[PDB]
Amino acid sequence: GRDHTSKQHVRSGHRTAPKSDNVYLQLLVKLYSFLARRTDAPFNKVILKSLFLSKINRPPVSVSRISRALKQKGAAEKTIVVVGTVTDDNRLLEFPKATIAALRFTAGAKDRILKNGGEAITLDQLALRAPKGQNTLIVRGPRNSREAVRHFGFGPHKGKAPRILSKGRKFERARGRRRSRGFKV
Amino acid sequence: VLKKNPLKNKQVLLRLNPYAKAYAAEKVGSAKVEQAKVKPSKGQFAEVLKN
Amino acid sequence: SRLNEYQVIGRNLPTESVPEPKLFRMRIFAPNTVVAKSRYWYFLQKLHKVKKASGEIVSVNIISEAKPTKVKTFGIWLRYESRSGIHNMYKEYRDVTRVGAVETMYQDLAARHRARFRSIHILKVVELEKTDDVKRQYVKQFLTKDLKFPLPHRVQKSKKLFQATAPTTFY
Amino acid sequence: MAKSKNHTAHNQTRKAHRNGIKKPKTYKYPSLKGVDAKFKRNHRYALHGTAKALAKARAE
Amino acid sequence: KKEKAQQKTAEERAAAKKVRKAANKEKRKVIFDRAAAYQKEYTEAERSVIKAKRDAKASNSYYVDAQPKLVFVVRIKGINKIPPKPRKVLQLLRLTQINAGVFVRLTKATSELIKLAEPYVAYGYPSLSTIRQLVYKRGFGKVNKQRIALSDNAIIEANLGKFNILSIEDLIHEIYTVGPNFKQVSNFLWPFKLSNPNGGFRARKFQHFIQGGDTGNREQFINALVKQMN
Amino acid sequence: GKSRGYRSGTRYAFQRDFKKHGAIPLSTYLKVYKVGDIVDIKANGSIQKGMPHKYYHGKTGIVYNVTKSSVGVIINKVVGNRYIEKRVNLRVEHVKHSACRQEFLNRVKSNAAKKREAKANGETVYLKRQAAKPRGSRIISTEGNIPQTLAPVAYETFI
RNA sequence: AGCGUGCUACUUAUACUUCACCGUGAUUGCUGUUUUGACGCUUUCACGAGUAGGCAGGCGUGGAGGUCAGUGACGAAGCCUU
RNA sequence: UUGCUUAAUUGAACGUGGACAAUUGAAUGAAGAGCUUUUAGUGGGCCAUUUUUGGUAAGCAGAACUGGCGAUGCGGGAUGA
RNA sequence: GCCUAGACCGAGGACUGCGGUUUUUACCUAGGAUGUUGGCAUAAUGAUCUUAAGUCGCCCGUCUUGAAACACGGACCAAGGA
Numbered sequence A: 001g002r003d004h005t006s007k008q009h010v011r012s013g014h015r016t017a018p019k020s021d022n023v024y025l026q027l028l029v030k031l032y033s034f035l036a037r038r039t040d041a042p043f044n045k046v047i048l049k050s051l052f053l054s055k056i057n058r059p060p061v062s063v064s065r066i067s068r069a070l071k072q073k074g075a076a077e078k079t080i081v082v083v084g085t086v087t088d089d090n091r092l093l094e095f096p097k098a099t100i101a102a103l104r105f106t107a108g109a110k111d112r113i114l115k116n117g118g119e120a121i122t123l124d125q126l127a128l129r130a131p132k133g134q135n136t137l138i139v140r141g142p143r144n145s146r147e148a149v150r151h152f153g154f155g156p157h158k159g160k161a162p163r164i165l166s167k168g169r170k171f172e173r174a175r176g177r178r179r180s181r182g183f184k185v
Numbered sequence B: 001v002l003k004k005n006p007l008k009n010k011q012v013l014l015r016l017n018p019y020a021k022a023y024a025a026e027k028v029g030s031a032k033v034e035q036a037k038v039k040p041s042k043g044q045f046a047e048v049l050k051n
Numbered sequence C: 001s002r003l004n005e006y007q008v009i010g011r012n013l014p015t016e017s018v019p020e021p022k023l024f025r026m027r028i029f030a031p032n033t034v035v036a037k038s039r040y041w042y043f044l045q046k047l048h049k050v051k052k053a054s055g056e057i058v059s060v061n062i063i064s065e066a067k068p069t070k071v072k073t074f075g076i077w078l079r080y081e082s083r084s085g086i087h088n089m090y091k092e093y094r095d096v097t098r099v100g101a102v103e104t105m106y107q108d109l110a111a112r113h114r115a116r117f118r119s120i121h122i123l124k125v126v127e128l129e130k131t132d133d134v135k136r137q138y139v140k141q142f143l144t145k146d147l148k149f150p151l152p153h154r155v156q157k158s159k160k161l162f163q164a165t166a167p168t169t170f171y
Numbered sequence D: 001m002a003k004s005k006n007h008t009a010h011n012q013t014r015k016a017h018r019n020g021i022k023k024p025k026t027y028k029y030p031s032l033k034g035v036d037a038k039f040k041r042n043h044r045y046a047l048h049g050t051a052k053a054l055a056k057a058r059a060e
Numbered sequence E: 001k002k003e004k005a006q007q008k009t010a011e012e013r014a015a016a017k018k019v020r021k022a023a024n025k026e027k028r029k030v031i032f033d034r035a036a037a038y039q040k041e042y043t044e045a046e047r048s049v050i051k052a053k054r055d056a057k058a059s060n061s062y063y064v065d066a067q068p069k070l071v072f073v074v075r076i077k078g079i080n081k082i083p084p085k086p087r088k089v090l091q092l093l094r095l096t097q098i099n100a101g102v103f104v105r106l107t108k109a110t111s112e113l114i115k116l117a118e119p120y121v122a123y124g125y126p127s128l129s130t131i132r133q134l135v136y137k138r139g140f141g142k143v144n145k146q147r148i149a150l151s152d153n154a155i156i157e158a159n160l161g162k163f164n165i166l167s168i169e170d171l172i173h174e175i176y177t178v179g180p181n182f183k184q185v186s187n188f189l190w191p192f193k194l195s196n197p198n199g200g201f202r203a204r205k206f207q208h209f210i211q212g213g214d215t216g217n218r219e220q221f222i223n224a225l226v227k228q229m230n
Numbered sequence F: 001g002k003s004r005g006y007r008s009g010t011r012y013a014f015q016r017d018f019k020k021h022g023a024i025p026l027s028t029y030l031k032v033y034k035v036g037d038i039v040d041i042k043a044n045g046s047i048q049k050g051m052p053h054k055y056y057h058g059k060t061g062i063v064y065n066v067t068k069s070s071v072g073v074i075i076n077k078v079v080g081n082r083y084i085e086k087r088v089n090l091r092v093e094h095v096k097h098s099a100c101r102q103e104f105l106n107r108v109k110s111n112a113a114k115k116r117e118a119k120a121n122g123e124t125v126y127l128k129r130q131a132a133k134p135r136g137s138r139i140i141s142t143e144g145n146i147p148q149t150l151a152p153v154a155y156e157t158f159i
Numbered sequence G: 001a002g003c004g005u006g007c008u009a010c011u012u013a014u015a016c017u018u019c020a021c022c023g024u025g026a027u028u029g030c031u032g033u034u035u036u037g038a039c040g041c042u043u044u045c046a047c048g049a050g051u052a053g054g055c056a057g058g059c060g061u062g063g064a065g066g067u068c069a070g071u072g073a074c075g076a077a078g079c080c081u082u
Numbered sequence H: 001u002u003g004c005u006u007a008a009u010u011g012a013a014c015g016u017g018g019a020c021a022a023u024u025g026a027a028u029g030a031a032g033a034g035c036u037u038u039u040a041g042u043g044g045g046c047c048a049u050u051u052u053u054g055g056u057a058a059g060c061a062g063a064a065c066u067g068g069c070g071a072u073g074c075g076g077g078a079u080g081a
Numbered sequence I: 001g002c003c004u005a006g007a008c009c010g011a012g013g014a015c016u017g018c019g020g021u022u023u024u025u026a027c028c029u030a031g032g033a034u035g036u037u038g039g040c041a042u043a044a045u046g047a048u049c050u051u052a053a054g055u056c057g058c059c060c061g062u063c064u065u066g067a068a069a070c071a072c073g074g075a076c077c078a079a080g081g082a
C-alpha cells in the first residue's frame, strides 16, 4: 500500500486543445504548437494557450481599448495582438495608424482600421512577420464584465445582483432589503 | 533500460568509481596497520573488574 | 550467551556550578549495549534525581569472566515483584561464569515465581569462596567428597522412525 | 419511538481537513472600513496631497 | 544513399566522441582524487579515535566519542490505523510505504520529529559501508519529480554539481560526514525501497528494540538490519 | 434547559488573581499601542466595559485600530473548514504587549550589526539560527573523581 | 503436544523487493524527413480498494440523410449447434 | 503629504531619495500555487482503546478525542461487520 | 579478496552513451540472450468441452448500524415492462 500525500490520477485542469472543431483554428494551433516547441519565445507559448480558450474567456476587444494601449509610452508602433474578436466603437473620436493581429474583425472595426491607414492581419500573417512576437502588445478584453458574473457569490451583505426575471417595486424589494420591512441584508 | 548493480558488475563499478581500481591494486581492503604492543589498561582502568 | 556483563559509566552533563560532576558506575547484565545503557539510566533515575537528557554515558565495556573454566558457586541477591507485592530473596547457583549464573537465575525465577525479566532487580552477584558460605542444600549436595552418581534410564535419540530392534535404556 | 442520536462531532475534523483549514489571504493594504472615522478622513487628504507633491517634483 | 549516409554520420560521431573522452579524462581524474582523499580521511579518523581511546586509558581518563550525527530511519509499519500526528510526521520524513528508508541529520528539531514516529520505525546509526551499499544498489535520484537510477556520474553532476557533488562517492561522502549540503543531497535521493529481511524480524516487531521488539533506536544494529533488508 | 449566555463558563477565567483584587496599576494605562502591534488578550473581571468574549481570552493578535480608551485587534478564528478574520474592540485593561516580538526585533538589530561588522572586516557571517547539535568528543579526567559503583537497593517498608 | 522463560531453524498474505504486461496521470522529443494519422508517433517516471454518487470512453436495438455503382433465390433475415 | 494629533518644529498614517543581495535572518516536507462556477448523494449510524454521565446492571442509554466498520476484499483469531 | 551449489527471468531490436582493456579509429563482460546439438512435423505442443482428484466457494435482489438468515419478493420460460 501507499499513504498518499495527494489525490491520485488528477488531470491537469487546464485545457490542452481547443474544444472547437473549426479546422482553421486547428491549423493555427498546429502552427503555434510548432512555434512554441521550437522557438522558446514566451510570446508563442502564451498565444498557444490563448488559442485553446473558450468564448467567455476571449471577451471582445474594442478599438478604443486598442487605441488606449497604443497611447502607452513607447507603444505607438507595436503590433497589437488579440486572440479573439476586435469590435468597432462609435464612442471613439479618432483612431491611429496601427497593425492589429486578431482572429476576427467585425466589419466596422476593420473599416475603421483600414480607413486610418492601418493593417488588419490574421495570426498566421503575424507568425510570418514576427515569429518570436517581436514588438507585439497582447491586449485582453474584460472577463468580469459579463452579465452572468453579477450573480456570482450572492449572499447576505455581499452586494451582488439577485437572479430575477422581472424588475420593479413588487419584485424582491420588501422584507430582507428594507428596515421598514423587518430587516435589511 | 536495465539497472546493473555495481557491487556485482565490475565494469559498472569502475564507471561509477574510478578509484575502485586503485583500492584493489593497493589492497586497501586488507591493509596491515603498523604499531607496537601496549596495554593502556594495566592500571586504574582495571576498575572495570571490581570496585 | 543470552547475556553479557557490562560496566556502564556515566555522569551529569557539565554546567557552570559543577564543572566536574561525579562519575558513577553500574554492573549490568544485558543482551547488548543498547539495553545496557537503558538499564543504567533506569537505575540512575530511581537512585538519583537525574534524567537521561541531562546526563551522558561515558563508557560501556564488557567485563569478561576471570576464570571461565573454574567451577564456582555463586550467591545472588535479588529484588523481585510478585503479583501481590515486592520481595527480597537470595539464591545460589553453580556455574563457571557470572553470566551463566545470572541466566540460570532468570530461568529459575521465571519457572518457580513467574517473574519476568522486567520484574527483577539484581542486587548483587558474589562468587562464594568458602564452602561454609554455601547455604542452600540444593547446591551444597554437589560439594561432598568423591561425589559420584549414575544416570539411570538412558533414552537414545533415533534418526529413523522405525527401529528393527527392541529398545534399551541401559547406561 | 423516535429517539435517536442527539449530537456528536465525530468525523467533523476529518471533513474539515479535506479542503481546510485555509488561512485568510493577506494583502499589503488593508481595508480602512471600521477604522476610526477621523483618522480615515484625514488619511484621505494626506494621500491626496502626497500624489500632488510627487506629480509636481517629477515635472522638475 | 543510406549505408553511405549512416557511415558519414558514424564518422562525425566517432571523431566528436574522441574529443569528449579526453575532456572526460580530466574530470575522471578529479573524481578519482576526491575518492582517494575521502578514503584517507576515513582511515585517519578511525585511527585517531582509536589512539585517543588508548591514550585515555593510560592517562587514567575516559574518552567519550562524539555523538552520532546521522541516522537511517526505516518505516516498518503499514499504512492503516495511524494517529494523525505520527502520520503527518511519517509523511514529512518521506516514509509513505512499509520498508522505506531515509537518511536524517540529527538535531533537536529532527530528534523530536523521530520521537513522534518511534512506534512505527526502526532507526540507528549507519556505517560507511552500509551507506555505500544502499546508494550503490538502491540509489535513485529525483530528477524532475522522477525516480531515476544513479547509473552514471553525469546524472549526479547535472543535479547536484552546483553543490560540488561530481560523483557517487562525493554523494556518499556528503551523507556519511554530515556535510554542508546534506539537505540537498539527502532530499535528492529518493526514499530507499528495501525488501523484507532475509531471516525475518524478531517474533513480534511493534515494540521497542530494548523490550525485545523491532522499533526505536537500535544504534549500531541498524547495519545488520540493512544487510538483511538491502 | 441548557444555558449559553455571553459569559457562561467564565467562573474561574475571569477571576482576579489571589491577593490581586482592587485598583489597576497605572502602568496599564500608560502603555502606547500602534497599528501593527501584537498584543495578548486577557480579560480583567473588574473592568466590565470593553471586555473580550471568553473565546478571545488568552489569544494573541494584531492591532488594527486605536481609539480613545481601546484598541481594535484582529484575531483568526477557526470556523468549520477555514479561519474567519475577527475584529474585537478591547479597552486597554484587557490588552498587553507580546514579548516574543520585542525579542525578535532585538535579533533583527543584532543580525544587522553582525553583518556590518563582517562587511567591514571583509568576510561573511551566518545569521540563521541553529537547533541544538549532538555533542562532540571529549576526555574526562578521574582526578579526585574515581568512578563510584552503585547497585539497586533492597526493598524496605517504612509503615 | 500443559504452565513460566531463553534459543536455533523453519512455514506462508492480494504486504515488501526485482522483472514482465494492461490501464490512468504526468513527462521527453518529433517539419529543408511532415511521411496521406501531429486527435499521431515517441522517451521516462509514478500510481491502480470502493457503496451512495459524479464524469469519461465504448458495446448493442427500431427508424432517417449520405456513401459502399455493398450482401442475396447459385439462398437475405430468423433459428439450432464442444 | 494632511483638514488628524502635540505647548511644539510633537506625533500618527502613507511616501520620495540613499544603503544593506543569495545565510533575505530555525527544522523537515512540498505530483506546485492561487482563483471561480456549477451540481450529485447524504442529513436513521454503529464499533474499539482512553476520558466520561445516568443506571444494580445490560450486546442499556448519553457525551469527548482518535482509529475503524458502514463502503472492504486479502493472511491470522476454528467460526464472527 | 578467492572458490563453490541451485532457482526464476531474457523486456528491447541498425548505429548513437558511459566506462574498461589497451596489444589498435581496435576489442570488451560496458545503454535488456546468444551459441550449439538432438528429436518432431501421419506429430512431441497449445486451447476448449466432459469428467475425477485437491483446495476453497451459504441465495440472489432489497430496506438496514448489522442478511446465508427463523426479514420480504422470486416454481419455470417467452414476449412486454419504468
Ligand SMILES: CN[C@@H]1[C@@H](O)[C@@H](O[C@@H]2[C@@H](O)[C@H](O[C@H]3O[C@H]([C@@H](C)O)[C@@H](O)[C@H](O)[C@H]3N)[C@@H](N)C[C@H]2N)OC[C@]1(C)O
Binding pocket: H049, H050
Ligand atoms: C498511565 N496512564 C494510563 C494510560 O497511559 C492508558 O494506558 C494504556 C492502557 O490502558 C492500554 O491498555 C488498554 O488497551 C489494551 C489493548 C486493547 O490495546 C487492552 O488489552 C487493555 O485491557 C486496555 N486497558 C495499554 N495497551 C497501553 C497504555 N498506554 O490508559 C490507562 C491509564 C491508566 O490512564
